[PDB]
Amino acid sequence: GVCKSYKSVALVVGVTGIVGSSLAEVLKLPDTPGGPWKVYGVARRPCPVWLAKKPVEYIQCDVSNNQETISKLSPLKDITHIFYVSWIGSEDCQTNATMFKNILNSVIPNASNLQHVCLQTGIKHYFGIFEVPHDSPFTEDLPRLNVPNFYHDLEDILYEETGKNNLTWSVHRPALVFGFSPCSMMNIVSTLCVYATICKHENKALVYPGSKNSWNCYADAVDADLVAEHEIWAAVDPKAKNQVLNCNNGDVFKWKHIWKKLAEEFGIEMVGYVEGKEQVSLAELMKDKDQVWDEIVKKNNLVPTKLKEIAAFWFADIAFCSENLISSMNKSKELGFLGFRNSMKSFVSCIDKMRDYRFIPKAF
Amino acid sequence: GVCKSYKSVALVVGVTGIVGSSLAEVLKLPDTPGGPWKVYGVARRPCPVWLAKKPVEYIQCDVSNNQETISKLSPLKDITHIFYVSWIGSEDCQTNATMFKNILNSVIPNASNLQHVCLQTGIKHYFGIFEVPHDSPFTEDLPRLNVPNFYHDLEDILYEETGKNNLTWSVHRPALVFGFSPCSMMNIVSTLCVYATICKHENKALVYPGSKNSWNCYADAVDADLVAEHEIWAAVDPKAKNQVLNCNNGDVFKWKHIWKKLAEEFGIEMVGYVEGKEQVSLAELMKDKDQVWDEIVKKNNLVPTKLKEIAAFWFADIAFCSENLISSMNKSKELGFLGFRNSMKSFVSCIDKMRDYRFIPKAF
Numbered sequence: 001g002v003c004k005s006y007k008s009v010a011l012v013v014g015v016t017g018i019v020g021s022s023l024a025e026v027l028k029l030p031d032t033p034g035g036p037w038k039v040y041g042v043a044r045r046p047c048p049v050w051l052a053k054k055p056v057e058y059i060q061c062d063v064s065n066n067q068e069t070i071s072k073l074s075p076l077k078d079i080t081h082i083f084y085v086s087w088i089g090s091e092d093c094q095t096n097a098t099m100f101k102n103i104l105n106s107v108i109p110n111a112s113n114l115q116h117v118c119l120q121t122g123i124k125h126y127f128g129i130f131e132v133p134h135d136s137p138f139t140e141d142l143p144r145l146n147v148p149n150f151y152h153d154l155e156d157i158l159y160e161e162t163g164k165n166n167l168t169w170s171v172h173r174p175a176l177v178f179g180f181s182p183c184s185m186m187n188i189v190s191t192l193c194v195y196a197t198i199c200k201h202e203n204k205a206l207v208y209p210g211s212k213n214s215w216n217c218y219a220d221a222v223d224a225d226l227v228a229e230h231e232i233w234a235a236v237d238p239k240a241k242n243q244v245l246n247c248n249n250g251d252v253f254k255w256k257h258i259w260k261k262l263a264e265e266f267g268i269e270m271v272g273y274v275e276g277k278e279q280v281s282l283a284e285l286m287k288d289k290d291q292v293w294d295e296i297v298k299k300n301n302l303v304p305t306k307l308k309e310i311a312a313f314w315f316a317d318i319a320f321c322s323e324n325l326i327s328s329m330n331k332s333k334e335l336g337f338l339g340f341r342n343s344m345k346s347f348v349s350c351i352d353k354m355r356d357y358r359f360i361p362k363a364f
Numbered sequence: 365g366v367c368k369s370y371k372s373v374a375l376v377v378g379v380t381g382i383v384g385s386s387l388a389e390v391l392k393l394p395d396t397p398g399g400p401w402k403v404y405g406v407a408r409r410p411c412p413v414w415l416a417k418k419p420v421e422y423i424q425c426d427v428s429n430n431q432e433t434i435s436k437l438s439p440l441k442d443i444t445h446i447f448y449v450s451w452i453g454s455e456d457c458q459t460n461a462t463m464f465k466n467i468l469n470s471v472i473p474n475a476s477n478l479q480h481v482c483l484q485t486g487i488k489h490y491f492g493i494f495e496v497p498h499d500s501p502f503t504e505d506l507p508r509l510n511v512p513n514f515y516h517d518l519e520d521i522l523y524e525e526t527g528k529n530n531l532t533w534s535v536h537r538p539a540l541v542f543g544f545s546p547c548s549m550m551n552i553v554s555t556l557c558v559y560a561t562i563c564k565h566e567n568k569a570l571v572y573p574g575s576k577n578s579w580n581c582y583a584d585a586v587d588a589d590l591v592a593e594h595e596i597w598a599a600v601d602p603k604a605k606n607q608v609l610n611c612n613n614g615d616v617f618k619w620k621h622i623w624k625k626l627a628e629e630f631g632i633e634m635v636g637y638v639e640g641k642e643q644v645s646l647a648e649l650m651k652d653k654d655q656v657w658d659e660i661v662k663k664n665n666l667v668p669t670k671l672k673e674i675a676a677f678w679f680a681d682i683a684f685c686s687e688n689l690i691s692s693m694n695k696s697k698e699l700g701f702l703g704f705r706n707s708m709k710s711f712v713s714c715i716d717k718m719r720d721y722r723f724i725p726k727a728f
């Protein structure tokens with residue numbers, strides 16, 4: 001029969017990532033703006049089984065290799081929108097820049113109907129890198145800090161390449177992401193579910209390892225599905241074009257309240273913040289747990305994951321010494337994007353979803 | 365000619381108040397839900413000139429007097445919606461309760477097409493009175509505190525009288541209100557504009573008198589027009605009926621940032637929070653300034669106001685020792701109300717509006 005017709009064709013670079021995996025779902029929903037969408041999903045690893053059960057055309061490609069990327073993406077003549085939702089896993093400015101340049105150099109000369117490039121960075125734009133920050137609430141008019149942030153390099157490539165080629169652009173700066181991918185290098189919900197699961201397995205309480213300040217302060221986050229919706233909005237709506245845009249759930253929460261919910265969701269005792277205690281390292285608490293995780297996977301018949309891949313304990317340790325990082329959604333709301341989530345409900349939805357996918361044990 | 369036709373008829377109780385004055389405007393806009401609206405506006409004082417220039421039918425009535433209230437409101441047979449946006453100016457539970465009972469007892473037996481009662485209370489529901497608070501973000505499922513809050517008494521009357529008479533109800537709990545009325549007993553924007561104006565008049569800097577914590581913490585507020593919109597939404601939309609609902613602008617701000625903007629708006633030097641200083645009383649700083657204000661009114665040809673009526677320095681002193689009071693808008697958003705304001709823009713809009721109305725001097 002005949003070749004299928006699509007209104008829009010997405011290239012999702014980082015399709016196994018915390019946002020890319022949500023784009024793989026949201027782009028294929030019937031009422032999604034710009035649909036019907038065809039989705040090409042790029043990542044470096046072989047396609048996981050969980051993603052092979054989705055109507056996404058997977059392209060295995062190391063996007064840090066220019067020749068390989070040209071070979072794999074230059075045939076894709078029908079792309080209309082690029083969603084760059086990847087990073088190399090370190091803060092190296094040049095390796096990250098190379099990945100994004102390779103996508104653009106392979107696609108721009110070959111996709112005659114290309115319209116738009118979405119670049120995903122983050123709120124680290126406002127306060128620095130992990131290796132003086134702005135005061136908050138963070139707004140998109142704040143200037144770059146004088147530090148070597150790879151986000152700066154990615155933006156500079158975006159502006160140059162889109163300007164030369166009459167393409168529109170958007171920069172998306174999500175808050176901390178609440179999502180479900182077990183292949184992410186920075187997935188807080190999965191990290192905390194894994195910790196809770198190990199505590200439950202060992203008959204131990206859910207002990208909060210963080211700082212006092214992070215227990216009590218206001219924090220914010222963004223559901224991965226909302227980031228997907230926001231990127232799609234900017235890809236399709238002329239009002240959003242050529243803009244830098246924050247993305248968060250629209251509300252605030254406290255880790256104190258999340259912690260209680262996490263313990264309830266796993267049916268275990270909570271030990272909250274104890275007055276006078278200093279933060280301890282969750283990465284250190286978990287450093288010898290690789291074989292315990294392997295045993296838990298086997299006992300619960302989970303999708304097989306390596307502990308350091310499903311969990312990022314180092315990233316929880318950063319979250320638990322952070323404060324004063326709230327970002328503003330006013331610019332997006334003023335431009336007409338009114339999407340939101342209840343963050344407490346979002347956190348629980350992500351636990352539910354990871355259980356459905358068999359990444360984390362069911363409640364017992 | 366013929367009697368005019370209206371779709372809805374509002375009784376705004378407290379029409380000179382910080383929210384009632386905004387209802388007097390929003391209800392008469394062409395695209396307001398439930399329109400066209402007829403507006404009866406009730407307050408105790410003689411109608412101010414500023415309000416007489418609006419298409420509102422003013423009813424001067426002391427609503428604490430039952431016989432008087434019956435006499436003045438029982439003839440109003442066409443009322444469809446009540447907006448109770450008043451309080452007596454003290455925390456006395458019985459005088460406040462009497463005012464609201466008198467409205468209901470005068471209207472319910474006489475307005476055959478009455479549909480709905482909107483009751484405005486506030487976030488003090490969650491943390492106590494001015495004479496242990498809940499942790500935040502505050503949500504509408506939080507139980508009453510064991511304290512004598514007149515809000516409890518008002519709610520109890522609302523539920524009883526609406527239930528007996530097959531009426532719908534809503535309870536609105538606004539955050540700190542950003543508005544323009546110079547007749548309010550609690551108008552923070554006007555209070556701070558008056559302080560700034562006195563500082564400017566005396567060739568003094570805009571000295572922040574508050575606490576460290578209130579300078580740096582996250583705070584929230586609500587534009588009076590947004591409270592009006594929210595009350596009207598609940599009055600007209602079946603989804604919102606019989607609900608307790610918070611109302612805020614949807615974002616957060618810091619007083620540190622507001623203070624800089626206030627100084628810029630008045631063209632004067634800012635002295636922000638100074639490390640190590642304790643809060644001082646703005647009420648004490650201003651206690652002898654009544655005649656200075658009279659002179660400023662005369663010199664700038666302002667609408668004549670008494671200092672203690674246009675400004676509430678005591679209320680600024682409470683704002684400047686408050687922290688941890690953020691409220692959630694998730695319930696309203698989940699029920700479909702997506703109204704919002706940028707709080708920094710709202711604050712400036714209120715300064716602009718008070719200058720337009722000649723309550724506060726123009727920029728010079």
Ligand SMILES: NC(=O)c1ccc[n+]([C@@H]2O[C@H](COP(=O)([O-])OP(=O)(O)OC[C@H]3O[C@@H](n4cnc5c(N)ncnc54)[C@H](OP(=O)(O)O)[C@@H]3O)[C@@H](O)[C@H]2O)c1
Pocket residue numbers: 013014015016017018019020042043044045046061062063064085086087088089099120121122123173174175176177178181183184185186187188
């Ligand atoms: N996660 C958060 O909470 C968060 C919050 C705010 C902002 N951000 C920012 O969002 C951006 C994207 O990160 P993310 O967290 O969404 O990523 P992520 O969940 O860690 O996913 C990374 C994705 O990039 C792919 N990738 C990495 N190296 C690749 C290569 N050489 N070739 C092809 N694919 C490659 C990965 O696939 P493979 O594993 O196969 O390589 C995976 O699909 C970053 O700038 C990050 O700082 C993240």
Ligand SMILES: NC(=O)c1ccc[n+]([C@@H]2O[C@H](COP(=O)([O-])OP(=O)(O)OC[C@H]3O[C@@H](n4cnc5c(N)ncnc54)[C@H](OP(=O)(O)O)[C@@H]3O)[C@@H](O)[C@H]2O)c1
Pocket residue numbers: 377378379380381382383384406407408409410425426427428449450451452453463484485486487537538539540541542545547548549550551552
């Ligand atoms: N202002 C805020 O920032 C704020 C924030 C959150 C919640 N709230 C709550 O909102 C509710 C309403 O207060 P508000 O601040 O909107 O009020 P407001 O600005 O102080 O206005 C009070 C109104 O009530 C009228 N009033 C008072 N006593 C009256 C009487 N005996 N007879 C007739 N009218 C009378 C006043 O008219 P006259 O002067 O003529 O008497 C005025 O119109 C209160 O429960 C308050 O705590 C206020």
Ligand SMILES: O=C(O)COCCOCCO
Pocket residue numbers: 121122123124125174175176315318319320322
């Ligand atoms: O937003 C980004 O640029 C990366 O995520 C930062 C998370 O914020 C620190 C606490 O985890």
Ligand SMILES: O=C(O)COCCOCCO
Pocket residue numbers: 485486487488489538539540679682683684686
């Ligand atoms: O919300 C209410 O019930 C009354 O206003 C409270 C203002 O909050 C304290 C700091 O000003």
